[PDB]
Amino acid sequence: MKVINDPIHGHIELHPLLVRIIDTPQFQRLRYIKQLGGGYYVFPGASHNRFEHSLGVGYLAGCLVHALGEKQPELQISERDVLCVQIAGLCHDLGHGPFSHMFDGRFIPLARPEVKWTHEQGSVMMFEHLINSNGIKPVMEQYGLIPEEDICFIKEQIVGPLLWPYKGRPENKSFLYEIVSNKRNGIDVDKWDYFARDCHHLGIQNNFDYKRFIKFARVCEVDNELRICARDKEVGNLYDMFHTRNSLHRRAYQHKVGNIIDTMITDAFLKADDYIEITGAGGKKYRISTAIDDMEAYTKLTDNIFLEILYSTDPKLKDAREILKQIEYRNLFKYVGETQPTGQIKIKREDYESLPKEVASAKPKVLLDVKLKAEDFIVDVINMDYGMQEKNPIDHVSFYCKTAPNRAIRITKNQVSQLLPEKFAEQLIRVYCKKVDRKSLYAARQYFVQWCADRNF
Amino acid sequence: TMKVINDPIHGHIELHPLLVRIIDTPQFQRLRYIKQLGGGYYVFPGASHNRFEHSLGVGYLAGCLVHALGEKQPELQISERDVLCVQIAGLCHDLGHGPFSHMFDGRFIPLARPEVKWTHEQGSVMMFEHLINSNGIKPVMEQYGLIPEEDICFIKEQIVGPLLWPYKGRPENKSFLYEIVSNKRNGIDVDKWDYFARDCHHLGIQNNFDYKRFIKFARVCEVDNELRICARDKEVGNLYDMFHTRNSLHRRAYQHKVGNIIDTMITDAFLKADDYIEITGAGGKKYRISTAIDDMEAYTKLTDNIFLEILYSTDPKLKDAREILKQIEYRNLFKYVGETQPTGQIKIKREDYESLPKEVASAKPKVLLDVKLKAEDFIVDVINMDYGMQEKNPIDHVSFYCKTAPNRAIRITKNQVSQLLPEKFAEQLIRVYCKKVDRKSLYAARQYFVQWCADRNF
Amino acid sequence: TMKVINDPIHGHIELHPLLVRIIDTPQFQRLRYIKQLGGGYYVFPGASHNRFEHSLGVGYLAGCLVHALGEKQPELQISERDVLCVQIAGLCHDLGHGPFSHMFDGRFIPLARPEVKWTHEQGSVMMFEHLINSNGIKPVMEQYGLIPEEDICFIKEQIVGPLWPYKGRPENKSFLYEIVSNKRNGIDVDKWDYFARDCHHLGIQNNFDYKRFIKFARVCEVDNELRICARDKEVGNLYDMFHTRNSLHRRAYQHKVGNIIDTMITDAFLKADDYIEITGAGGKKYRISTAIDDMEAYTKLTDNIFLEILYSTDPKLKDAREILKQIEYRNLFKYVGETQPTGQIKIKREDYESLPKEVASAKPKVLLDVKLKAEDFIVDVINMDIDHVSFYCKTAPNRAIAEQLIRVYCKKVDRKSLYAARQYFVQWCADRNF
Amino acid sequence: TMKVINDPIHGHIELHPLLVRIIDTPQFQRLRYIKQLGGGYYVFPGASHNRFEHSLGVGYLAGCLVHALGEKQPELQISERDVLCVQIAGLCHDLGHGPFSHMFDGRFIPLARPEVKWTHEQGSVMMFEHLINSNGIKPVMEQYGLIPEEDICFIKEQIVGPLLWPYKGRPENKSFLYEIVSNKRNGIDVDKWDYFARDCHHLGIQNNFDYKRFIKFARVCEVDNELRICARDKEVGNLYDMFHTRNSLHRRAYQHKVGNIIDTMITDAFLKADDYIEITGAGGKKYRISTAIDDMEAYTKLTDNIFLEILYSTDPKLKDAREILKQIEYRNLFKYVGETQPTGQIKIKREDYESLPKEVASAKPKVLLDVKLKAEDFIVDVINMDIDHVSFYCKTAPNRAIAEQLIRVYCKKVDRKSLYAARQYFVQWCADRNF
Ligand SMILES: Nc1nc2c(ncn2[C@@H]2O[C@H](COP(=O)(O)OP(=O)(O)OP(=O)(O)O)[C@@H](O)[C@H]2O)c(=O)[nH]1
Ligand SMILES: Nc1nc2c(ncn2[C@@H]2O[C@H](COP(=O)(O)OP(=O)(O)OP(=O)(O)O)[C@@H](O)[C@H]2O)c(=O)[nH]1
Ligand SMILES: Nc1nc2c(ncn2[C@@H]2O[C@H](COP(=O)(O)OP(=O)(O)OP(=O)(O)O)[C@@H](O)[C@H]2O)c(=O)[nH]1
Ligand SMILES: Nc1nc2c(ncn2[C@@H]2O[C@H](COP(=O)(O)OP(=O)(O)OP(=O)(O)O)[C@@H](O)[C@H]2O)c(=O)[nH]1
Ligand SMILES: Nc1ncnc2c1ncn2[C@H]1C[C@H](O)[C@@H](COP(=O)(O)OP(=O)(O)OP(=O)(O)O)O1
Ligand SMILES: Nc1ncnc2c1ncn2[C@H]1C[C@H](O)[C@@H](COP(=O)(O)OP(=O)(O)OP(=O)(O)O)O1
Ligand SMILES: Nc1ncnc2c1ncn2[C@H]1C[C@H](O)[C@@H](COP(=O)(O)OP(=O)(O)OP(=O)(O)O)O1
Ligand SMILES: Nc1ncnc2c1ncn2[C@H]1C[C@H](O)[C@@H](COP(=O)(O)OP(=O)(O)OP(=O)(O)O)O1
Ligand SMILES: [Fe+3]
Ligand SMILES: [Fe+3]
Ligand SMILES: [Fe+3]
Ligand SMILES: [Fe+3]
Ligand SMILES: [Mg+2]
Ligand SMILES: [Mg+2]
Ligand SMILES: [Mg+2]
Ligand SMILES: [Mg+2]
Ligand SMILES: [Mg+2]
Ligand SMILES: [Mg+2]
Ligand SMILES: [Mg+2]
Ligand SMILES: [Mg+2]
Ligand SMILES: [Mg+2]
Ligand SMILES: [Mg+2]
């Protein structure tokens, strides 16, 4: 057994199978993908990658399954179950692209709007390619795993079911599907891991305490299926969890300067495409947008490409190059304004492309010498929620009492406190102007105020 | 001749000779034997800190804030006298605390002497006067440039309210100096900053607020013909987070059920042990626990020691009280029965609690069980949660400013921040305990409690 | 059932019902009012912790270490009875401190009753016996699978020392006797808790990493008997331990002002004795120095005594009380001199009253007009004691491969008398060859 | 306007607009892509920080110390231009680092061009001159009250050494300003405090030094006729603790068994990859990895990207180097053979680095050697292992004052019998030459 030293956790022990899986090009590719993407250009201490995040998530999944097993010997938890859960926690982010959430957040929807792609599909495909190429099946068989069923069990833990829709484990082990990714209420070890790590690196103090949560967790057989349950004295702690998630999102992840830097990087990638060449299986050639359909080509697509565009000399990639150079001089797109949040005038994705035009067509009352077209405006729509899209995540949790540990109850928002939030979803709209001269900024402000007053925000 | 003292929360804090002179007095050293969280030490074993270090840290933070404000804007004309007066006020702002701190003025004085209104800030002012008079600090203050006649009143008005522009210590143009140690318009000051960090450090909990950023982004504005401190308009969410952290601390630690019941038992022991404890004051007169607040010589000798004085006693007269304390040693506490759902903070006035238990004894449950319980077998506790105004939003009383127009102060409404902010800012709670340990009486008390709750439609 | 307690240093500590039963007794709760550093609270404001949390943490650490050792080597045959016994021994290892902790048995008893030899470990054993017999704990232990007769002896031997002398356990469990306390090399959980808590409270960065130590801890046979071993690579690991120990002892435990305040407190206690009465077993009245002969009276001896002297009004206590007042104005005794750490004369706690008399009797070579008696001199004796361990190599997991300081203080603080007292000290040192 | 940046180590840092103008340049921004440790990132997962934050923190600490010294001793005649100059010097002290930091100038250049002596401080000075002359900073400096020539010389002399008063930036009166950023006499400077704090925070190791106490108690006192930084006589334990922490870091992190091996593998891959990688410089001329240090416009584009340029290549000419990198991706690392002779009785010089594995093969063991070795299978590591002169001052007298070599050898051939033979060759190499 190896021993690795994590600054966040203590010393992590690794099963030999995990060491075998980690020493592959597919997993080692994560050393060159940043956790927070463009936010590194606002918080200089955020230089961590996904390698340590995956290590920590696997460690925490193993710890949680062990703690659950050693308190209730009637659940019949074996070592192969722990190994499968740890492997699933280890290989849950294999499909991330350059700059992490930017790519599948901004680049793929724009370059190829006819495909529905998420990084979990990429993670599953990467896992399959890794297992097939590196020949891990005999090693798995050596350590007491059954590839035929355990591979599907691991796959379903990452994406979901691909009555009882799962095929990896029976209903008796239903509580094993709510550890790495919870589809019901969103309480899992991923949140704990990146809360701790991001708070450590960014320079902000963390508020949640997951060890206390592990101390009070149980399996209380909710609605004909075994599920993980909490004590009824920890509702406020879960509300605090979600509050700190929201605070992190509004302080760091949705910083407007970081968002505009990400937008500029996406523009550079869009302009530089059709000229970058990537080699895949069979000697075929791919692009940045089309590399997601070949994993041998996807394996060679990391944050390196950024610099490949900055240091290039080809006159064909000149335009994109210029944009990146601006990022190195801090000649960024300027910020004009935003609109107050609203929970009932939602804007769908399909309308995003039409937003800039609406701002360009607004006619301010006072005549202005400067005239701005529809290509001088960037409109960004931000969605803030608790993860359930206007629903209350805490209303899908099951609680038990000290007197009757094996009986599940439900707690309503009115039985906790009157100081809890009245809503659980909102949006924001931000406007940026590409032109940097003062007159253009004044004009953009006039158009923005006219457009906002017209639509009554 | 400036001293250096090391604090585990802050770094190494430097002390002026005048502060060193003031600290080396019995009236200030008395704070070494008064616990901060009181009865909460019996639930959180790490909470053994006292008020001495709290006062030191508050004075240090007040000095730092004044120094930063003077650094940013030279036109404010802040002299050394102002800084030293603010530091002294921060030092002597909690001199009037009694045994187990809040518990005393929270529970004991209102019961033993219900005909008087007493707050520990009045005690702090009286103790400060007694300290200055006894220790002869006036010439020492004069030798360092202070004017006792005006500066003493300035410090007094800093500690308490003003008792048309009502203050007298300074002129109006320095009015921003009155809202550093204690703020009355809202609840932003350095006391909260100090004890948030201290309590989180000692209770094994993580703090969420960062006051250094707030110091980085503070200014002085001329709002309503008054000079007052402003934060920049991008810090609204941080202030909401500050108040959320305050509420979280209150609900997790300060209002713990077992801590509250232990405090109630200690108050009962003190109430029963009175009339048999004599305290010597000025002139050789003898005082009591509830009467010592009328004489500072007797109040100086009243600390947590009295607790143990009742535990180790041998007089037959103090038997009853002694028994109660012994029950705390074996952990035979009053048993939790029930709690009521939250409502607004104004539903039961102060002059109603005495009637609450009797009502629970007047309920007749449908089952109509045996083991009748009298009105003396029930304890009813009323808890009030709020953001500091008990009905209002403190953020509505904060002046902001913008980068483009730093000298112009504005106001930000709740609807302009977010839609996930709390709907209300006040809350009330009721808890019921039973003074019995056998299971049958607990089940009976549960039936009475449910009948009462379903009878007043809470 | 299991009870969870939050610790600022460690995480959430789980307590067995037997430990909860032991904790909820007056004898254990007495530890809430005895401070750890003692007189160091008046130099470092943040050091206000007591021995209650220290005992809790030591028990937690001992249990964790035993559990890890038993889990990583199932051939040692460690049962849950041994884990419970070790946890109990760690829990009740410091029941014998008096007021202000190490000062009392270090400074008060020798100066009060020179003919009596007493350590706080004997007090801990006696108080453990009193706690067990006075609260009816034996049936509770029998209810959880323990054998009281042998287990009580096992715990006592874990607290105090005894061709193998121990009788609590057989010869093949010799590694269980060096967890709570180790007199050979000094690797034990008591010191780990000391280091962690003191560094956290005082504000001094710690350097030892005990989790790493527990990670690579094995039991390998040495000298035909089992001992706890350490991997070869962990040589810089168990050097931060000694560096931190030296740093703490130099920076905090031997600070001049703290020692002076301890000296003043002991002087006030000595003057106060013969007037404070404490009720013991049967109603008999004891004294501060004599209370250690009865545990009924010893249970009520805490830091409270301090304030009892300070707030008194009886005219018989005007002297001791006066001394304490000088602490409250920072009118402390005055440092004069220091002398040999060589140890030529390793002064033991049999003649401490004579030392100031010896200093006074010394006649300086140069005549000094100011005369000083033996009532205005104090002698503070600071008795401070790599001891090497048995390592083990990777390829062979089953194979293995004191000073003293004396300071002198002058009660008189006028410069003229201090000048002469400085001259007396050098003559005394020359006479005693220090 | 002042600009605030958040550092997890130091809190919130204010930057003067001149520093903000210096920072927002490509020559400073290339530091975002060079790692603090290099190979150590492959043993400690949490050591992924770069030199950008290190430079920021060093500048912050230097400014703080200068301000404190000037404030507590007003007779030292410390102006504001001096504070700005010290901050700039601290900001641009590591501007000349190459890929993977100390591995480059310490290991790659000697093995590639032994005829050239080069340190990264010369690179830092050259890059500072390039940045200033290329980004038009001189008028901006003149705008804020600085004289370009004297201040430029002062900063350069603060970075490099003297370049009986050998300095020219400041007179003999300001002799204490030259030991804040870099101090080669004893080794007490902010550059090392930042190293200690950041490395302990990231790796997980905990340090014991407390630099705030040192700054509080530090003063400036006359020693040997010159003004010098002096510490109170009670700081002896703290200084010993500082040295102990430095020793612990060096023996536990910077000299780990596997990090050095990975560094040697990376250097071998780079050496094989040379002669085929082209870098464009001034005037369109193409340079090499070894010769890029002769031009700064080409040196600007030399970062840790080269690694990924070789690993993700398709040119057959780079196959050999590529293969080596692939081994690092499978943990098929070179093995450990032997280690010998601390204290450097010879103190090897850089010029001999590319001759050591020739004497190892030269040695002829008397034992039976059926398997033969050659001067390719051996890699030589020359890992270096490196109380002081402190002028203390007593409380009662405020104004009165009162390193070894190491060698290791690895075998590229990882066969059991080949490893056995290599373990013999080394013994005769060390015994013949008196190691
Ligand atoms: N194997 C491996 N170890 C890593 C990795 N990242 C960090 N480490 C740590 O670095 C240490 C070095 O291990 P190895 O590279 O296998 O070196 P080694 O211990 O001499 O190899 P063995 O002799 O086979 O045990 C490990 O113990 C890990 O704790 C990684 O990606 N793979
Ligand atoms: N004066 C004083 N110092 C305290 C107190 N609490 C902690 N300390 C610290 O303890 C240290 C001891 O200082 P002193 O008691 O005055 O002894 P000293 O260093 O010899 O000072 P002098 O006798 O005046 O020269 C101080 O430097 C403080 O930092 C306190 O209540 N009063
Ligand atoms: N029993 C006990 N708990 C303590 C003590 N000190 C701190 N605590 C903590 O305070 C909490 C209060 O527990 P109890 O005093 O037993 O109150 P309770 O939970 O209502 O009692 P039960 O209903 O029997 O569980 C415990 O869970 C401990 O974690 C102590 O000395 N004894
Ligand atoms: N200028 C600059 N800021 C950085 C850098 N790295 C992190 N930051 C921080 O990121 C924040 C945002 O960068 P800015 O360029 O100032 O964006 P901005 O505040 O909208 O620009 P201004 O309106 O001119 O103030 C800054 O306040 C810095 O604290 C950097 O390399 N350069
Ligand atoms: N003193 C230390 N404190 C904390 N982490 C450490 C320390 N020494 C090493 N580490 C890191 C290095 C690795 O990330 C992990 C363990 O490595 P380490 O024990 O040195 O393994 P190794 O590969 O050198 O030895 P081996 O395989 O021979 O046991 O912890
Ligand atoms: N090494 C240390 N690290 C941190 N805090 C310390 C250290 N030594 C002492 N302290 C604490 C003790 C006091 O709380 C505060 C200042 O004490 P210290 O500087 O030792 O004064 P002192 O009384 O010994 O000397 P003096 O008054 O003669 O300068 O710092
Ligand atoms: N939210 C919290 N975070 C951290 N520590 C807490 C929190 N609430 C309580 N603690 C502390 C108090 C005690 O020291 C320890 C356990 O207390 P707690 O969980 O409240 O038990 P309890 O005795 O009140 O409940 P019960 O008997 O119902 O289980 O943890
Ligand atoms: N809430 C926060 N807590 C801690 N650090 C923060 C927070 N918000 C931002 N930071 C970081 C981001 C930068 O590293 C640094 C300053 O950022 P910030 O205050 O947002 O400046 P800015 O450039 O966006 O605003 P402006 O130009 O309007 O003053 O602090
Ligand atoms: Fe994740
Ligand atoms: Fe306060
Ligand atoms: Fe102990
Ligand atoms: Fe540096
Ligand atoms: Mg290994
Ligand atoms: Mg994911
Ligand atoms: Mg998810
Ligand atoms: Mg001192
Ligand atoms: Mg107050
Ligand atoms: Mg207040
Ligand atoms: Mg309980
Ligand atoms: Mg002991
Ligand atoms: Mg800005
Ligand atoms: Mg350097």
Author numbering:
A (entry chain B): 115 to 276, 284 to 578
B (entry chain D): 114 to 276, 284 to 578
C (entry chain C): 114 to 275, 284 to 506, 515 to 530, 546 to 578
D (entry chain A): 114 to 276, 284 to 506, 515 to 530, 546 to 578
Study text:
Sterile alpha motif and HD-domain containing protein 1 (SAMHD1) is a dNTP triphosphohydrolase that catalyses the breakdown of dNTPs to constituent 2′-deoxynucleoside and triphosphate, and is therefore an important regulator of cellular nucleotide homeostasis in mammalian cells. SAMHD1 dNTP triphosphohydrolase catalytic activity requires assembly into homo-tetramers. Sequences at the N- and C-termini of the HD domain stabilise inter-monomer protein-protein interactions and incorporate four pairs of allosteric, AL1 and AL2, nucleotide-binding sites. Nucleotide binding at these sites promote tetramer-assembly and regulate SAMHD1 through combined binding of G-based (AL1) and 2’-deoxynucleoside (AL2) triphosphates.
The State-III C2 tetramer, AC Dimer-2 is further relaxed with more disordered C-terminal lobe- linkers, active sites are exposed and empty. BD Dimer-2 retains the tense state with substrate-loaded active sites, all allosteric sites are occupied. d The depletion phase, States-IV and -V predominate. In State-III, the active sites of the tense side of the tetramer also maintain the same nucleotide configuration as in State-I and State-II. However, the active sites on the relaxed side are now completely empty with no substrate or products bound. Further examination of the nucleotide content reveals that on the tense side, in both State-II and State-III tetramers, the active sites contain substrate dNTPs, and the allosteric sites are loaded with GTP-dNTP pairs. In State-III the further movement of the C-terminal lobes away from the lobe-linkers results in loss of all remaining interactions constituting a released conformation.
